[PDB]
RNA sequence: GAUCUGGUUGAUUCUGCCAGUAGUCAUAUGCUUGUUUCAAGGACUUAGCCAUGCAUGCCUCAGAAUCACUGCAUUGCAGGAA
């Protein structure tokens, strides 16, 4: 690795021990634009990467074609973090790198609940949801203990990395376009904190953004 | 186990069929085979045609005994065929 010097207010606060988790970030809903902030606050040997898809892309020109590779990369942790990203390069290893980097800036937390009696730790989404990308759409359905992941290959990875165990699924549209299939399943998971349930409502006391709190630091850093 | 993949373009997103995939006391047809338990089997086309043999008879203490029938006894007794 070649070293990090932060260009963001956020990044400074992460690079010293003030912000010690990604849930502080997630709360006040600040954007992450330096991949090193996800590296810093998530322990190593607990991230699981992999490449869902690598694929050629062309364009037409005079004399012949022009070729550019492309790639999809998915990343996350079984405590409820996941992201996805896809990018392009004119060589192979390029697109690989650029995907991984992208993916670590679309990290989003995932909420889990129960199907029935509340015992143990949550193994399943609390509700039905949907996502749509392109024509192809995806629906995720709660299921009881031991039901397991009943899904196609493509979705099953998304779910497994999230920390969702038992589930069921179904889809419509052309599911054979893989890039859209991925992104659909991703948009699905997101919306479990996008929906409001009697578990919550209470009008919680709200808190100041880390920037306000730690403002002392960031002033000195300017000088 | 409330699931999918390949094929229309120079490349992309759809619609839509074709092809792949798993069962079936559901039948046929090739290749192949060491032990044991269990079990369907001329229904599909022709409810078309049939050689030969067998497939429904029955007697007890208790309906009719002169077998010219059998045993024992010697003029009676017990079996008793068709």
TrEMBL record:
Q: Where is the S5 DRBM domain?
A: 47-110
What processes does the entry annotate via GO biological process terms? translation
Its protein name is: Small ribosomal subunit protein uS5
Any one Gene Ontology MF annotation carried by this entry is:
structural constituent of ribosome
| Keyword Transcription part of the UniProt annotation | no
Q: What keywords are assigned to this protein?
A: Ribonucleoprotein, Ribosomal protein
Give the UniProt family note.
Answer: Belongs to the universal ribosomal protein uS5 family.
Q: Can you tell me which residues the record assigns to a coiled coil?
A: none
Q: Does the keyword Ribonucleoprotein apply?
A: yes
Q: Mention any one GO cellular component term assigned to this protein in its UniProt record.
A: cytosolic small ribosomal subunit
Record field: transmembrane: none
């Amino acid at each position: 690795k070649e070293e990090w010097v932060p260009c963001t207010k956020l990044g400074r606060l992460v690079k010293e021990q003030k912000i010690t988790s990604l849930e502080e970030i997630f709360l006040f809903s600040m954007p992450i634009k330096e991949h090193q902030i996800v590296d810093q606050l998530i322990k190593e040997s607990d991230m699981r990467d992999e490449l869902m898809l690598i694929v050629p892309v062309q364009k037409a020109t005079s004399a012949g074609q022009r070729t550019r590779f492309k790639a999809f990369n998915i990343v996350g942790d079984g405590n409820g973090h996941i992201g996805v990203g896809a990018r392009v390069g004119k060589e192979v290893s390029l697109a690989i790198r650029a995907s991984m980097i992208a993916a670590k800036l679309n990290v989003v937390p995932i909420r889990r609940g129960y199907w029935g009696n509340k015992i143990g730790e949550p193994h399943t989404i609390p509700m039905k949801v949907t996502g749509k990308c392109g024509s192809v759409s995806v629906r995720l359905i709660p299921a009881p203990r031991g039901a397991g992941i009943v899904a196609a290959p493509v979705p099953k990875k998304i779910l497994e990395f999230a920390g969702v165990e038992d589930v069921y699924t179904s889809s419509c549209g052309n599911t054979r376009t893989r890039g859209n299939f991925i992104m659909a399943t991703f948009y699905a998971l997101r919306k479990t904190y996008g929906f409001l349930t009697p578990d919550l409502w209470a009008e919680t006391e709200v808190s100041r953004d880390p920037t306000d709190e730690h403002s002392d630091f960031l002033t000195m850093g300017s000088k």
